[PDB]
């Protein structure tokens, strides 16, 4: 591995509520300051990473509803004006698009009949927002035309609350997972989906008719024996986790089966490896990757930060020196790498933020 990091700073947010999400803005241009967002309680807080471990508070957003509990945030930009944007959501089930420059709410989306666990923006189209809910469904929105493009759920949709989802690298497909122990593939490069996406860009005030996607392109309940709270693509492979204190690397179908040739009926699944760690068997503990997918990071319920080198084939030999600090004891809900992998931020259940600079 050889990846080393030093803890250069930490701070605590005065609300003292758990911090459930952290995301670096990967849209900032090279040389611009490194900025990340933290979410917890009814707060969205922006910070700037400066020299000598300085974490400079930029602005704070306070949701008028004191009972709102943000679980996730995601960065985008306005395709017309090149202006940065931030989506936030949680407990209330409302998507809020905040202007990060003014820290004011631009617009919101109501629709999910329950809480939102994850928000992800399409890797190519910055207007395609994917929300994942406790309502058993995933929703795809066009935030430029304010249309609900598709609702992924129904007859062969998730049976329980959806916990996480991720787009592949080029955004041709989505892999979702939840409480129902399943992992479902949803192709968005299908002619039906591409057309729905085209139709949402054409919509201008009869309201827009969202596609109801009742059927996935693959479904498996044979990777994990309990909830699947985190999923991300690793090339054509999948990285997913449950309570088994391991992140599992797998692929739909048999060993030689190409991801784009698998049938929705595909019965088989090939487990390829495992990333073992400890004291992370509780729910809502997300893992992250850096932009180049060279590094893998997960925090545990006791303040430890596991980091793996993905360019090392053996998932045992891949483990890098686990990151610890004697004052970091709370649960690490989520981590975020800066776009250039030089900074790694971890947020905790005690409202603390930790900064790990690469050596």
């Amino acid at each position: 591995c050889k990846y080393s990091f030093k803890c250069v700073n930490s701070l605590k947010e005065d609300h003292n509520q758990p911090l459930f999400g952290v995301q670096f803005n990967w849209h900032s241009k090279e040389g611009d300051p490194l900025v990340f967002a933290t979410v917890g309680s009814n707060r969205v807080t922006l910070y700037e990473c400066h020299s000598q471990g300085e974490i400079r508070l930029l602005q704070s957003y306070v949701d008028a509803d004191a009972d709102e509990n943000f679980y996730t945030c995601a960065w985008t930009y306005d395709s017309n004006t090149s202006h940065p944007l931030l989506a936030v959501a949680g407990s209330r089930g409302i998507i809020r698009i905040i202007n990060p420059i003014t820290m004011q709410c631009i617009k919101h989306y109501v629709g999910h009949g329950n809480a939102i666990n994850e928000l992800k923006f399409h890797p190519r189209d910055p207007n395609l927002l994917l929300s994942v809910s406790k309502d058993h469904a995933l929703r795809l929105w066009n935030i430029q035309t304010d249309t609900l493009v598709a609702i992924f759920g129904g007859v062969e949709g998730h049976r329980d609350e959806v916990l996480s989802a991720d787009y592949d690298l080029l955004g041709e497909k989505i892999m979702s997972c939840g409480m129902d122990h399943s992992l479902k593939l949803w192709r968005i490069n299908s002619k039906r989906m591409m057309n729905a996406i085209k139709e949402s860009y054409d919509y201008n005030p009869r309201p827009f008719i969202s596609q109801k996607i009742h059927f996935p392109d693959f479904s498996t309940r044979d990777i994990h024996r309990n909830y699947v709270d985190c999923v991300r693509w690793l090339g054509d492979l999948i990285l997913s986790k449950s309570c088994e204190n391991a992140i599992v690397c797998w692929k739909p179908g048999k060993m030689e089966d190409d991801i784009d040739k698998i049938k929705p009926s595909e019965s088989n699944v090939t487990i390829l490896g495992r990333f073992d760690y400890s004291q992370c068997d509780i729910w809502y503990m997300r893992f992250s990757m850096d932009f180049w997918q060279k590094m893998l990071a997960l925090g545990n319920q006791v303040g430890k930060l596991y980091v793996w080198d993905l360019e090392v084939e053996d998932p045992h030999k891949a483990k890098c020196t686990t990151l610890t600090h004697h004052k970091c004891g709370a649960a690490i809900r989520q981590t975020s790498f800066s776009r250039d992998s030089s900074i790694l931020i971890a947020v905790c259940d005690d409202a603390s933020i930790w900064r790990w600079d690469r050596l």
Partner: peptide, 29 residues
């Protein structure tokens, strides 16, 4: 190998996104 080829797919595809990001000039926060 399964790894070698999966890593090249990641390389090629993250490069596509990196080239698209290089073209952009997103306004600083």
């Amino acid at each position: 190998s399964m790894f070698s080829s999966n890593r090249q797919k990641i390389l090629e595809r993250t490069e596509i996104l990196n080239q698209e990001w290089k073209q952009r000039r997103i306004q600083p926060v």
